[PDB]
Amino acid sequence: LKDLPAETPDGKKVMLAANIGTPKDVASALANGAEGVGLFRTEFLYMDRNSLPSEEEQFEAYKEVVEKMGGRPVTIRTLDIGGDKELPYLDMPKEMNPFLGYRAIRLCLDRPDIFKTQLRAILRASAYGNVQIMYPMISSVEEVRKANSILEEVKAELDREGVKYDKEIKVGIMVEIPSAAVTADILAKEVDFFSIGTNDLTQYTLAVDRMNEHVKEYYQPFHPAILRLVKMVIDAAHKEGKFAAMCGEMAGDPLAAVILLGLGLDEFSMSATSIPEIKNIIRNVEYEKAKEIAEKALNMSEAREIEKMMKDVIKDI
Amino acid sequence: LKDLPAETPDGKKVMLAANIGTPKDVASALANGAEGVGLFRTEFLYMDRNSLPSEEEQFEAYKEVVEKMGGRPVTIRTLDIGGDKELPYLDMPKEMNPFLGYRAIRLCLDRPDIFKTQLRAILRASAYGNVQIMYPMISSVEEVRKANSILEEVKAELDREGVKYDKEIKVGIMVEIPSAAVTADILAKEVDFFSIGTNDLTQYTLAVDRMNEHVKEYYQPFHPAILRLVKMVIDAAHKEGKFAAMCGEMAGDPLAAVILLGLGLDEFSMSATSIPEIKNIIRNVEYEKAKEIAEKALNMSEAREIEKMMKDVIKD
Numbered sequence A: 001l002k003d004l005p006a007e008t009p010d011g012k013k014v015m016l017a018a019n020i021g022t023p024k025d026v027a028s029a030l031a032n033g034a035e036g037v038g039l040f041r042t043e044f045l046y047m048d049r050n051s052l053p054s055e056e057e058q059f060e061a062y063k064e065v066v067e068k069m070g071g072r073p074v075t076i077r078t079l080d081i082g083g084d085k086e087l088p089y090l091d092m093p094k095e096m097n098p099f100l101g102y103r104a105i106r107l108c109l110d111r112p113d114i115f116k117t118q119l120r121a122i123l124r125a126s127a128y129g130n131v132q133i134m135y136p137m138i139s140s141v142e143e144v145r146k147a148n149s150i151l152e153e154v155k156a157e158l159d160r161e162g163v164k165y166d167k168e169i170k171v172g173i174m175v176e177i178p179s180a181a182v183t184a185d186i187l188a189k190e191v192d193f194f195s196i197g198t199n200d201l202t203q204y205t206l207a208v209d210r211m212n213e214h215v216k217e218y219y220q221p222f223h224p225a226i227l228r229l230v231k232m233v234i235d236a237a238h239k240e241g242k243f244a245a246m247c248g249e250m251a252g253d254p255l256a257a258v259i260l261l262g263l264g265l266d267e268f269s270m271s272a273t274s275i276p277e278i279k280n281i282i283r284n285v286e287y288e289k290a291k292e293i294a295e296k297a298l299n300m301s302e303a304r305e306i307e308k309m310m311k312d313v314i315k316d317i
Numbered sequence B: 001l002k003d004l005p006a007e008t009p010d011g012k013k014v015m016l017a018a019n020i021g022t023p024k025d026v027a028s029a030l031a032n033g034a035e036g037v038g039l040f041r042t043e044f045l046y047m048d049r050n051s052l053p054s055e056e057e058q059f060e061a062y063k064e065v066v067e068k069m070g071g072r073p074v075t076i077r078t079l080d081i082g083g084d085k086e087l088p089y090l091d092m093p094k095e096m097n098p099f100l101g102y103r104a105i106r107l108c109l110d111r112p113d114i115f116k117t118q119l120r121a122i123l124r125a126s127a128y129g130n131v132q133i134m135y136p137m138i139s140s141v142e143e144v145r146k147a148n149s150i151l152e153e154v155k156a157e158l159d160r161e162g163v164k165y166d167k168e169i170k171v172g173i174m175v176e177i178p179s180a181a182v183t184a185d186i187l188a189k190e191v192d193f194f195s196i197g198t199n200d201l202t203q204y205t206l207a208v209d210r211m212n213e214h215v216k217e218y219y220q221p222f223h224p225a226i227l228r229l230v231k232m233v234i235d236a237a238h239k240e241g242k243f244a245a246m247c248g249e250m251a252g253d254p255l256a257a258v259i260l261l262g263l264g265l266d267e268f269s270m271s272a273t274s275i276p277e278i279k280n281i282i283r284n285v286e287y288e289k290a291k292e293i294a295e296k297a298l299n300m301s302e303a304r305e306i307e308k309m310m311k312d313v314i315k316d
């Protein structure tokens, strides 16, 4: 049943959640047993249009998802877009390397008018259910503090207006810039949770644009560096009594599941149709064994060795 | 201070070397007391022309530098160029993010004809002085192996041709892709030395193109992540009994000098005119003190605070 938990035969439970891109994705997420939305991408509100999305428009979309998820947590990622999306109204610079450029939280900090509208909408939606905020493209704890300063300005304005919001709203970050993983210990003290964006973490850590056909082979999700950074983030979160999620494609990859379980990942967020397959793996591997396998993976020097091992593991299940 | 060693009062010596971009840079390097060339950039041979540089042309350039340096080590970096530099004859593709694309060692491995021509010229040049080879843009040990395999093929060619080269030639890598720093322990077993390219390490680690005016402030050389990766690379080299150099701009920065010293950096490579100032700092700070200062820096959370501290350290 989609209602059985992702729980090992020796009693370790993890959370399986859905990544969504619009409110229409909710039905499929629940049908597949999602326990929450680990990543609500908000780009849909900004794309394919000629004006900034109003607070009310954003609010209605966030509220719909929050309500339909019936108390399950909904982690909303703030604007994660750059000038490569070539959106007219946004009036963005042409850039030589947009992936390393003026995008996401950097755009939001430079344009707090835009950022405040979205934060207002999210905070208003939090009165209707279990909402979390997640900042993308964070390189440093200094940026988290800047972002939170704006969030607090918005909360104070809502207080003055008598507009309600969840005063206990949890605010975390995407860990995708390598510096955020390397300094996860510093960040863990000042965020409520981490969610690892392994797609971009892998690209930045290996300096590879995986959409570039000429270098696609250099995108290596099982590179030991990636496993090391993932472990570092998970351990840093736990040292501070906080949770570590992953919403990058890796979390929905059956080959990565046992390693992630063994490393102590708390929440796996993925395309909804991937949930049953990962749940089945978790329900059929002992946590004690998964820890041993993760340990073996961390001792390996090549991505292909880890992949060979993980293929053998899945075969055995 | 020219002929004076870069050595602390309590006896810790480091090597100060020059970064160069053309053989014409040698005189100034020597004038400022460079003990070697920590980075010979080879892009000049490929720029401003209608076809690839011949093996002979490359050879002549490398030979000149190696001889003029009179026995001092010359670390030659292999082709580091990407499609963002418009060199039509090169035929490199248009890319959305060239800094993360088909460039440097990736180009060389895909086009071994180009790579072999350069490697032959460097090897040939190594018969006339102290030459080292350094591969740029390495993300993994597997790439090092591939590059060395081509090097070995070239060595074999020269042997059959009875052409002379240094059999003991040292081969290392630039550490600038974050994965290479994170797995420096793996890489250290299979390279002869590291040189840290902090310019690009900082750009990749913080995901920032520092030439982008909208985000230039996100480029922060003293971010704790950069210091931690630098320490990791130095320690990894040392565990394998090997040396760690740095040729990024940080090595020439007076604010970084005491931290780098305290971390145990072996070689600082920089614009020639920066050498005297760095030497002066090293000669006027105790190694024991530098180690404490480095430890303090590595315990801090904010680049701005680290910079403040270092400004006070060298104020004297």
Ligand SMILES: [Mg+2]
Pocket: A136, A176, A197, A199, A200
């Ligand atoms: Mg991302």
Ligand SMILES: [Mg+2]
Pocket: B080, B136, B176, B197, B199, B200
């Ligand atoms: Mg470089």
